[PDB]
Design an enzyme around this catalytic site. Structure first.
Site, mmCIF file in Angstrom:
data_model
loop_
_atom_site.group_PDB
_atom_site.id
_atom_site.type_symbol
_atom_site.label_atom_id
_atom_site.label_comp_id
_atom_site.label_asym_id
_atom_site.label_seq_id
_atom_site.Cartn_x
_atom_site.Cartn_y
_atom_site.Cartn_z
ATOM 1 N N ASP A 1 0.813 -1.227 0.000
ATOM 2 C CA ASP A 1 0.000 0.000 0.000
ATOM 3 C C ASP A 1 0.844 1.275 0.000
ATOM 4 O O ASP A 1 0.385 2.333 0.426
ATOM 5 C CB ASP A 1 -0.947 0.027 1.201
ATOM 6 C CG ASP A 1 -1.861 -1.176 1.253
ATOM 7 O OD1 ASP A 1 -2.500 -1.490 0.211
ATOM 8 O OD2 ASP A 1 -1.942 -1.800 2.341
ATOM 9 N N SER B 1 2.217 6.518 1.716
ATOM 10 C CA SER B 1 1.375 5.609 2.434
ATOM 11 C C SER B 1 0.001 5.830 1.859
ATOM 12 O O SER B 1 -0.621 6.848 2.122
ATOM 13 C CB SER B 1 1.396 5.933 3.924
ATOM 14 O OG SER B 1 1.109 4.774 4.682
ATOM 15 N N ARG B 2 -0.457 4.887 1.045
ATOM 16 C CA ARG B 2 -1.771 4.977 0.419
ATOM 17 C C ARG B 2 -2.900 5.085 1.424
ATOM 18 O O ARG B 2 -3.866 5.814 1.184
ATOM 19 C CB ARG B 2 -2.010 3.809 -0.529
ATOM 20 C CG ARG B 2 -1.505 4.109 -1.905
ATOM 21 C CD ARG B 2 -1.288 2.880 -2.715
ATOM 22 N NE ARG B 2 0.026 2.990 -3.322
ATOM 23 C CZ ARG B 2 0.365 2.475 -4.497
ATOM 24 N NH1 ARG B 2 -0.530 1.796 -5.206
ATOM 25 N NH2 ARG B 2 1.607 2.647 -4.958
ATOM 26 N N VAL B 3 -2.769 4.368 2.542
ATOM 27 C CA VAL B 3 -3.702 4.469 3.660
ATOM 28 C C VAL B 3 -3.822 5.937 4.072
ATOM 29 O O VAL B 3 -4.919 6.434 4.337
ATOM 30 C CB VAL B 3 -3.253 3.569 4.829
ATOM 31 C CG1 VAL B 3 -3.707 4.131 6.181
ATOM 32 C CG2 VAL B 3 -3.735 2.117 4.607
#
Lengths: 266, 49, 128
Positions: free
Chosen positions: C94, C119-121
């Site tokens: 991610d 950080s895609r989150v």
């Protein structure tokens, strides 16, 4: 290491080579136009500064006008004039410094920041002209109160020849100093007008030009040298990266080919 | 107004058809020059010459 | 690690490092005589990591909310993030933290390349 790494980091140097080469010829034409602008300035100095030589004018707080330019990429023009002004300002630490050109304002702002009271911008594109010379000289009189210092000094770079230049200093004498010069009487000047006052403001403008024209030609001959050496050195890296490429290209193809042969036995 | 600036304005009447006016005449006339006053690092605004 | 997740606790798993794993997987397969693929890796060397890393999850309420957070490690050669395995794993995760020798010697430690790391989150999992 990879083909993509080598292809994009060769290409950029092939540009710099083409580029630094273009500005070696750009600032070759710009030298022809600035040798004629130089000669017309230097010839005019002998005629103007001769009166002072004959009148025998000498000196009796100080304003320092330093001239280089706004541009970089020109050997060590700015670096060894700032080096001169520093060896001079070492003797006289209590002086007001006026800068013409940003690359000398920064050289000087890092060394004696509070001595600098004025800066001139956008200075070394075309040749210098009496209009820039006089309008710089006019603010000098206005905002710095030029007419009042015991001593005024222009720092500039003299083109010794095409292949080198010399950091040089010159004095400007105010009205008072002109009037009270040993052999002033030799000339029958009409003491009605302010011949000394005018002679000073004219020579402020005029000898600044004299300085700017030479410094500028000193620069144009340092720029077509730094770029000449740049193309000669950028091409040395293009030799390294042409060969490494012709290598990495072959290696790529051979290793994909080994993969294919292995995959084709089993 | 000052003897230099005073002869200059006179050098712009004699400079301003478009005949006896080569390229460097209308380049003797133009200035990309901006004077910046300085006090203790910079102080006030940069003005045209 | 799953035992925690599957029972409403939280595990962090560090896979240090997946490069070395892929290499073993390659050794295992060549000696079994399975016909090699790119750089001799097995045809499915991507699945190797994709199925590993999909197990790391955050379960629903119905499943007790347990989590498995993975932090796999990959090692590149001469900063070549275009290489085979690193491309696979970047595909999967991610986001990544990129570390650079250039930045380490400039004093920057951890040697994070802030422009490349993500950080895609995102902010979604960060104390307000």
């Amino acid at each position: 290491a990879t083909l993509k790494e080598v292809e994009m980091r060769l290409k950029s140097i092939k540009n710099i080579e083409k580029i630094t080469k273009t500005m070696k010829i750009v600032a070759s034409t710009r030298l022809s136009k600035a040798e004629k602008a130089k000669i017309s300035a230097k010839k005019m100095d002998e005629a103007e500064q001769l009166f002072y030589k004959n009148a025998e004018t000498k000196n009796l707080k100080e304003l320092i006008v330093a001239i280089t330019s706004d541009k970089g990429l020109c050997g060590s023009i700015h670096s060894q004039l700032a080096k001169a002004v520093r060896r001079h300002l070492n003797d006289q630490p209590n002086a007001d410094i006026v800068t013409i050109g940003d690359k000398i304002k920064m050289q000087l702002l890092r060394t004696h920041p509070n001595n600098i009271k004025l800066s001139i911008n956008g200075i070394g594109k075309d040749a210098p002209t009496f209009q820039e010379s006089a309008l710089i000289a006019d603010k000098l009189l206005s905002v710095m109160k030029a007419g009042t210092y015991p001593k005024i000094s222009i720092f500039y770079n003299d083109p010794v020849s095409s292949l080198s230049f010399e950091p040089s200093e010159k004095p400007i004498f105010n009205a008072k100093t002109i009037e009270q010069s040993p052999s002033f009487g030799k000339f029958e000047i009409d003491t009605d007008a302010n011949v000394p006052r005018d002679l000073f403001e004219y020579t402020l403008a005029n000898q600044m030009l004299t300085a700017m024209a030479q410094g500028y030609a000193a620069e144009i001959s340092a720029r077509r040298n730094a770029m000449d050496n740049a193309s000669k050195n950028a091409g040395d890296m293009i030799n390294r990266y042409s060969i490494l490429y012709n290598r990495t290209r072959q290696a790529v193809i051979t290793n994909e080919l080994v993969d294919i042969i292995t995959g084709a036995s089993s | 107004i000052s003897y230099a600036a005073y002869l200059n304005v006179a050098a712009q009447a004699i400079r301003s058809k478009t005949e006896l006016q080569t390229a460097s005449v209308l380049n003797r006339s133009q200035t990309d020059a901006f004077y910046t006053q300085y006090k203790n690092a910079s102080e006030p605004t940069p003005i045209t010459k | 690690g799953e035992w925690f997740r599957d029972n409403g606790k939280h595990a962090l798993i560090v896979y240090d490092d997946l490069s070395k794993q892929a290499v073993a997987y390659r050794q295992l397969s060549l000696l079994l005589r399975r016909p090699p693929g790119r750089e001799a890796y097995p045809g499915d060397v991507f699945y190797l990591h994709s199925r590993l890393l999909e197990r790391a999850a955050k379960l629903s309420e119905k499943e007790g909310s347990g989590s498995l957070t993975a932090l796999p490690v990959i090692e590149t050669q001469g900063g070549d993030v275009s290489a085979y395995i690193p491309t696979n794993v970047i595909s999967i995760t991610d986001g990544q933290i990129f570390l650079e020798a250039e930045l380490f010697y400039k004093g920057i430690r951890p040697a994070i390349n802030v422009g490349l790391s993500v950080s895609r989150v995102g902010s979604a999992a960060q104390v307000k």
